[PDB]
Design a protein around this nucleic acid. Sequence first.
DNA 1: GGTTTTTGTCTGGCTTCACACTTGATTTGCATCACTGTGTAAGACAGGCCA
Length: 335
Amino acid sequence: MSLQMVTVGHNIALIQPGFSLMNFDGQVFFFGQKGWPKRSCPTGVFHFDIKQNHLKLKPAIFSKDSCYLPPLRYPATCSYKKHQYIIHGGKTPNNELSDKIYIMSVACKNNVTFRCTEKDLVGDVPEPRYGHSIDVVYSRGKSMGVLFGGRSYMPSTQRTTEKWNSVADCLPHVFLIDFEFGCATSYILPELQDGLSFHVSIARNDTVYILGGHSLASNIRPANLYRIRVDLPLGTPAVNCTVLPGGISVSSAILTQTNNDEFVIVGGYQLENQKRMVCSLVSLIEISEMETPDWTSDIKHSKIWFGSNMGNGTIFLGIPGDNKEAFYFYTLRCS
DNA sequence: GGTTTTTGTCTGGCTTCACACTTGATTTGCATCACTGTGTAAGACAGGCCA
């Protein structure tokens, strides 16, 4: 795992904490710019090209049948196999939380244009949230989305302008979501007692593993690991969760896929005052510590760090500038 | 209804200021001076995407 500094072009200001990267056919794209989209790029979606350790953001266009979704911070995203991306939730430039679901696909590639379609949701729609997970599980030749966790504003009855921005963890209900028709079913599980946000999520076959996270009520970053199995018979699905020992304690960690069936997670925040400098390896479930990479002193002495998974087993991370550039960016590679 | 208060009424002879008038040398009131540094926005100017 080698660390590499990156320089950025004129629109470095667009990058902010909560951004996302999506990988389409080896090409990387960036979503969730700071501010509302400007005339220079009306969609807010960018080709994310790092050539010779230099990052260029190039405007991407949407198809005629697309939504123009707002930039979103901390939405739950996953990849769905045409190959497409699922966006649910997030914060808007106006600080509203979106409950909507957007679906991204490559509509046309000339020398890329995207199709962005919103899927309406009925039934037990999850309250709009950020900092939550969504993945796709496969059971008996059927595909279903699993959504869990996060935080949101207070409900309209208790919300008050003096604490207008105050947040609480969402109730820890598992949500099954059929993307074709847009339906949602909520499952209360006895093993999931507390709320959780900014956790890590790993989906394999009919299972989703939940790692780390932060629970607001206790203000604990629990060192538990949860396995979630989903069976899809012809009738109503069945979901069963089990607690597993050996769970790491980390919030806002980043996750990437090395080779096949091996995942590595690079640090997040282990305590409010402390940062998780170590890295973990998950084999599909067993967790082993890895040799910590050659962090520079700037990374070591920063209080805040943020990043995203690029797709190619490589992480794109960023650190805040000195008091006297706004951000300094690095790329950490694996495999 | 009785039983309690507020607020007047009628005089004058009192006490305590304000005004009266002047002159001209002080004292106050008031608007102005000359002057730059700093914020602001009107307007040069650098710039990179796509044809």
